[PDB]
Amino acid sequence: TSTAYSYKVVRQFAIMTVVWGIVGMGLGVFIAAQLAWPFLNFDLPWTSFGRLRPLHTNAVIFAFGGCALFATSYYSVQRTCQTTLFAPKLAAFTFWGWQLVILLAAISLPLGFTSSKEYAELEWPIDILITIVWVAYAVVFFGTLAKRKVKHIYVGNWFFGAFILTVAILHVVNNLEIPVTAMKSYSLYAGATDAMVQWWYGHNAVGFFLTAGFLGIMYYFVPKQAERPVYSYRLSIVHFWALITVYIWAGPHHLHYTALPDWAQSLGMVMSLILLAPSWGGMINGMMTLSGAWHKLRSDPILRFLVVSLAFYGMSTFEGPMMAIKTVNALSHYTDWTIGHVHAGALGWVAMVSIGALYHLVPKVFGREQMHSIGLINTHFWLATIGTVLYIASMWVNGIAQGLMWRAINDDGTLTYSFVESLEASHPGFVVRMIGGAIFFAGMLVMAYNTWRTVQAAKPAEYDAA
Amino acid sequence: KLEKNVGLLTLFMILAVSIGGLTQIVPLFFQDSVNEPVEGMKPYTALQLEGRDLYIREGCVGCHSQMIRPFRAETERYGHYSVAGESVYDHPFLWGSKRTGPDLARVGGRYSDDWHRAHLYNPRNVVPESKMPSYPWLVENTLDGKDTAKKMSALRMLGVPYTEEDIAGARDSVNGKTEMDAMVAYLQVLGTALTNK
Amino acid sequence: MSTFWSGYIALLTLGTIVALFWLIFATRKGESAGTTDQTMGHAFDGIEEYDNPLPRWWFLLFIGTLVFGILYLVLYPGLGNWKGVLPGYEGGWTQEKQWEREVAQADEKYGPIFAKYAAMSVEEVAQDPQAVKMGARLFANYCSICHGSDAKGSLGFPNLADQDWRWGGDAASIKTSILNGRIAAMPAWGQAIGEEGVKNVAAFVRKDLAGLPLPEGTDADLSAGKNVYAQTCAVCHGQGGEGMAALGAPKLNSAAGWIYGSSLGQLQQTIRHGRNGQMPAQQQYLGDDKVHLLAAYVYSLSQ
Ligand code: HEC
Ligand code: HEC
Ligand code: HEC
Ligand code: HEM
Ligand code: HEM
Ligand SMILES: [Ca+2]
Ligand SMILES: [Ca+2]
Numbered sequence: 001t002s003t004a005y006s007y008k009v010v011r012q013f014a015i016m017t018v019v020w021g022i023v024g025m026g027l028g029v030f031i032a033a034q035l036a037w038p039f040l041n042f043d044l045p046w047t048s049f050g051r052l053r054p055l056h057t058n059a060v061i062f063a064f065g066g067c068a069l070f071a072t073s074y075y076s077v078q079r080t081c082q083t084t085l086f087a088p089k090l091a092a093f094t095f096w097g098w099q100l101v102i103l104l105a106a107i108s109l110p111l112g113f114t115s116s117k118e119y120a121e122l123e124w125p126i127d128i129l130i131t132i133v134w135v136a137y138a139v140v141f142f143g144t145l146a147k148r149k150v151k152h153i154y155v156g157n158w159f160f161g162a163f164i165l166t167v168a169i170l171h172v173v174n175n176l177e178i179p180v181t182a183m184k185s186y187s188l189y190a191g192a193t194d195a196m197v198q199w200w201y202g203h204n205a206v207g208f209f210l211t212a213g214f215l216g217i218m219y220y221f222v223p224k225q226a227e228r229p230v231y232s233y234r235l236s237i238v239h240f241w242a243l244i245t246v247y248i249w250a251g252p253h254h255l256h257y258t259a260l261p262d263w264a265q266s267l268g269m270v271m272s273l274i275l276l277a278p279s280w281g282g283m284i285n286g287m288m289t290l291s292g293a294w295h296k297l298r299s300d301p302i303l304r305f306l307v308v309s310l311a312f313y314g315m316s317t318f319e320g321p322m323m324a325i326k327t328v329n330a331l332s333h334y335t336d337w338t339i340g341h342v343h344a345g346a347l348g349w350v351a352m353v354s355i356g357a358l359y360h361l362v363p364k365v366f367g368r369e370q371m372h373s374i375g376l377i378n379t380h381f382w383l384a385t386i387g388t389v390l391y392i393a394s395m396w397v398n399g400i401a402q403g404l405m406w407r408a409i410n411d412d413g414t415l416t417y418s419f420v421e422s423l424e425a426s427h428p429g430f431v432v433r434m435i436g437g438a439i440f441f442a443g444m445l446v447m448a449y450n451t452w453r454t455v456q457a458a459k460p461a462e463y464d465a466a
Numbered sequence: 467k468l469e470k471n472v473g474l475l476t477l478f479m480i481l482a483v484s485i486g487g488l489t490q491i492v493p494l495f496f497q498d499s500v501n502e503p504v505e506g507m508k509p510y511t512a513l514q515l516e517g518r519d520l521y522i523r524e525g526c527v528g529c530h531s532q533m534i535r536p537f538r539a540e541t542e543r544y545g546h547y548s549v550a551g552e553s554v555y556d557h558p559f560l561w562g563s564k565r566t567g568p569d570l571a572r573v574g575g576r577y578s579d580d581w582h583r584a585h586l587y588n589p590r591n592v593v594p595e596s597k598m599p600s601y602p603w604l605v606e607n608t609l610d611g612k613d614t615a616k617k618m619s620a621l622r623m624l625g626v627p628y629t630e631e632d633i634a635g636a637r638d639s640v641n642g643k644t645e646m647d648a649m650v651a652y653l654q655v656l657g658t659a660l661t662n663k
Numbered sequence: 664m665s666t667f668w669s670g671y672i673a674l675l676t677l678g679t680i681v682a683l684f685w686l687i688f689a690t691r692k693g694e695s696a697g698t699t700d701q702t703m704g705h706a707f708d709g710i711e712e713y714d715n716p717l718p719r720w721w722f723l724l725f726i727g728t729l730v731f732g733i734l735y736l737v738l739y740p741g742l743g744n745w746k747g748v749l750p751g752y753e754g755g756w757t758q759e760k761q762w763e764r765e766v767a768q769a770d771e772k773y774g775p776i777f778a779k780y781a782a783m784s785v786e787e788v789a790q791d792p793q794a795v796k797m798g799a800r801l802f803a804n805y806c807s808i809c810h811g812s813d814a815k816g817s818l819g820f821p822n823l824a825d826q827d828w829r830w831g832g833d834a835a836s837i838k839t840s841i842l843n844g845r846i847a848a849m850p851a852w853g854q855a856i857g858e859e860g861v862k863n864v865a866a867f868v869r870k871d872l873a874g875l876p877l878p879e880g881t882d883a884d885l886s887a888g889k890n891v892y893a894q895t896c897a898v899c900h901g902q903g904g905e906g907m908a909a910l911g912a913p914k915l916n917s918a919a920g921w922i923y924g925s926s927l928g929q930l931q932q933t934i935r936h937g938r939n940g941q942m943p944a945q946q947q948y949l950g951d952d953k954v955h956l957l958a959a960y961v962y963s964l965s966q
């Protein structure tokens with residue numbers, strides 16, 4: 001029998017997406033505040049900024065983004081090819097497995113156990129666990145594909161598929177490390193080589209985890225919510241293969257004008273610029289899909305999210321290539337500009353798209369026809385947008401100020417500004433950003449409240465067969 | 467068409483996605499300039515190594531780059547632009563990606579130990595407008611040197627030419643020293659290797 | 664780079680570029696001129712898809728980036744060992760060579776200026792308003808973090824703005840301080856002199872030398888202090904507490920210039936455990952030129 005989608009796992013990951021969203025973004029607000037008002041460090045090792053930071057980072061990407069991807073792919077794949085998830089128990093494992101990972105991150109990082117590698121900060125025993133959970137996830141996803149009904153595999157799953165495999169490779173390679181003790185390992189690599197392995201991993205983390213994986217989301221939810229066909233199949237092909245291949249090369253745009261050899265740096269810029277095309281093929285395909293149905297934007301705030309989501313995606317896949325030009329990175333690198341780019345993509349693209357996707361799916365998965373309050377989806381939307389824009393704006397101001405101030409020479413060749421002067425210049429920015437994030441965070445609470453109210457709804461949920 | 471073929475798609479993906487990794491990372495394993503240590507440079511001493519791991523645990527990297535870019539103004543502000551050879555024994559590398567505080571690639575001997583101690587204990591206390599967290603626990607904590615031996619052995623295995631002399635009694639180079647002692651020792655070696663070769 | 668890895672890179676790089684051009688043109692095959700519509704066979708849940716063409720502009724943007732990629736890889740290092748063809752740079756462009764040039768050009772510009780002040784004595788530079796402005800700017804960059812942004816110091820760190828100098832305040836002394844650094848050594852008297860001994864000299868130094876009043880009912884033996892001071896302290900600080908600039912022993916007949924506080928308790932700690940001030944040498948970080956200007960700047964401060 002069994003021909004009714006396995007909605008159990010999707011339900012768990014959905015809820016947990018909202019929970020980690022809150023925890024992750026809360027932490028974000030908190031460390032933002034620390035940068036403004038250092039007393040919030042509290043002279044405690046576990047609550048100081050240096051240790052909390054990678055918690056925000058891992059919480060927000062792997063916990064929030066992660067769960068969003070699980071909830072999204074498990075929902076999307078099942079329907080997009082019309083069978084129950086392959087091995088529903090192995091998928092259940094990947095839930096608790098993943099939760100255990102996040103919980104270990106929460107305990108381990110403020111405790112000081114970090115590899116220092118950005119977005120790979122968790123120590124070796126946790127990297128073993130991750131690999132196990134990931135392999136299990138790969139089997140659940142690709143298995144579901146392997147036992148589909150239709151001859152064709154939806155382009156949404158090309159992206160998911162890619163993301164899954166390539167994150168697996170990435171994760172294993174960049175975490176090769178000799179264990180010294182329980183929670184301490186040394187990287188296999190050093191110096192320039194380590195830097196390259198790191199940013200090959202680092203960029204392709206957002207390249208595939210935060211771009212590819214989420215374009216999979218976009219490809220299901222934009223058309224499904226809009227109820228239109230996907231403008232240009234062909235674009236999907238080019239835009240997919242070109243992205244999947246060019247993105248890997250973008251590693252070196254992190255290490256511009258560093259000890260990384262010149263040749264690699266260039267290879268990074270050149271391919272980062274090439275990448276602009278395939279990236280936009282994503283947003284073109286998503287937005288032109290809405291053509292004719294633009295009137296739905298005043299009507300449906302869930303669609304608003306998805307669309308505005310692409311606006312920021314587009315912007316940050318433009319900004320990225322620009323900042324990957326050596327001369328631009330020459331100003332941008334080390335400054336708050338990078339953080340702005342990050343959050344534009346992070347709040348504006350990743351968060352917005354997954355918000356929208358959840359708002360769509362959460363009711364469905366809880367055997368319920370829609371969210372509790374559509375008005376709160378709209379008020380969420382505005383908080384989330386105002387929030388994102390403030391954050392971006394304050395980081396551009398800060399980043400330009402920093403870049404400029406650091407390199408500012410006088411008429412007699414001497415450096416114009418002390419580093420502390422640049423620090424001071426940044427304070428207003430640090431505060432606006434803290435408010436910007438706070439506002440964004442408030443919207444997440446509005447989501448939590450909304451989701452919860454809708455979850456009370458029915459209790460023998462499960463309404464989804466053919 | 468490869469979109470009805472589950473394994474064919476899988477294979478071409480794992481293929482497509484590999485090219486950049488193979489072309490950027492692999493050749494660096496074999497490039498000389500990024501594996502040669504700078505002239506006279508030694509591995510980190512037991513204490514320095516122990517402090518580097520303290521720097522790592524505290525998240526210092528999150529606010530501090532160790533990578534001077536070859537521009538005049540960076541040069542003027544911090545010193546000689548960082549060189550591939552300087553970080554050749556850095557498992558893992560600690561070039562930054564952010565400068566909330568200044569670059570530390572050459573904090574060198576630019577400040578006294580005494581300053582470093584005061585400043586880590588409470589940066590606002592010496593640099594009133596600092597946004598750096600206070601790190602007073604570094605003073606209350608004592609290294610026992612239990613694992614220093616293992617760490618060096620591990621790192622030698624990874625290429626770092628620690629002597630048998632180094633590993634033997636890396637413990638008693640470290641035992642009884644405070645975390646703050648170790649942090650300062652580490653900071654005082656940063657970038658010194660280049661400017662005294 | 665060996666010549667194998669050199670080709671290895673170039674081939675895979677250009678191979679990917681050739682690959683992309685192929686991809687872009689291959690899927691652009693029987694393209695439907697414009698926005699067309701119609702669907703395709705087979706749906707997924709509900710999702711269906713138009714067989715629409717690649718947008719003309721997006722195609723060109725893709726070709727733009729690819730063409731530029733070649734253009735750049737020809738002009739600049741990247742394709743393996745392929746040193747650039749970029750004009751103006753002899754032997755091809757590297758980030759190093761670009762820096763060499765940048766500094767070299769700065770030296771042709773700011774060189775004469777530095778040269779001009781280097782020819783003058785420290786005090787001559789100090790009465791040149793332009794130079795002082797530069798000294799001030801140098802100071803803010805390399806000194807402000809220890810000696811304050813106002814140059815007025817803080818606990819542990821001399822105020823360079825005042826008229827009190829530990830190592831002497833003539834130009835030559837000031838230049839030496841900055842050029843060669845300075846380490847002071849107030850030895851510890853705790854063990855040597857006894858706890859009561861410490862308490863007494865401290866009180867003596869505070870009341871009788873520095874002319875500060877003693878906290879209420881602190882029965883110290885000032886006579887003892889006086890004697891302790893003459894026996895031990897006076898050798899470096901001069902009896903009378905005039906200080907000795909040779910040793911960086913600061914004057915004790917005025918708390919004005921003290922960097923370790925002036926409270927009885929603080930004196931007691933200085934006296935009991937010693938002090939080792941360090942002013943780091945700048946000869947290496949800044950070089951003779953910058954240092955000369957900085958000496959002029961500091962000299963200027965006090966007038
Ligand atoms: C922190 C590491 C400092 C750096 C950076 C700078 N100075 Fe300094 N300086 C420092 C101390 C702790 C002392 C006192 C040393 C002692 O005797 O205990 C000093 C002293 C000087 C002096 C001598 C003042 C005197 O009384 O004779 C000068 C002229 C001086 N410092 C100048 C100076 C300049 C120009 C600096 C920037 C290039 C600078 N100092 C940096 C501590 C530190
Ligand atoms: C984020 C906030 C951090 C944290 C996590 C660290 N530091 Fe720093 N740091 C920060 C700022 C804004 C400044 C400038 C103001 C000041 O000097 O206090 C600094 C400064 C330093 C310095 C002096 C650098 C110089 O002037 O050349 C050092 C040596 C330093 N910080 C060290 C350091 C260590 C060891 C850290 C981990 C315990 C650390 N910092 C963290 C901001 C931040
Ligand atoms: C020989 C060297 C001596 C001896 C015998 C004494 N002093 Fe001390 N002293 C000396 C130096 C070079 C310095 C400067 C230390 C530094 O800047 O790091 C000092 C300092 C002091 C101070 C502090 C002044 C301040 O607050 O800035 C005091 C209070 C002081 N010395 C007192 C003192 C007494 C009471 C002594 C006899 C017991 C004595 N000194 C001896 C050098 C030397
Ligand atoms: C919602 C409110 C948020 C706030 C207030 C916030 C704040 C911050 C702050 C203060 C930092 C450190 C900045 C610095 O060192 O200058 C940071 C880093 C980061 N955050 Fe957030 N964040 C938020 C949400 C998110 C979300 C949803 C994501 C999802 C991906 C995210 C991803 C990141 C990443 C990747 C970094 C590291 C940036 C880097 O290493 O350059 N953040 N965030
Ligand atoms: C066309 C695709 C993109 C390109 C070429 C690109 C390029 C760049 C560049 C040049 C930097 C600065 C590196 C540095 O100076 O340190 C950067 C930082 C970053 N970007 Fe992107 N970006 C792209 C898309 C995105 C998107 C959509 C996101 C959103 C998730 C994102 C997330 C990040 C993060 C997290 C960092 C900081 C990593 C660090 O801590 O150094 N990128 N990116
Ligand atoms: Ca890891
Ligand atoms: Ca960063």
Ligand SMILES: [Cu+2]
Nearest residue numbers: 203250253254
């Ligand atoms: Cu990147």
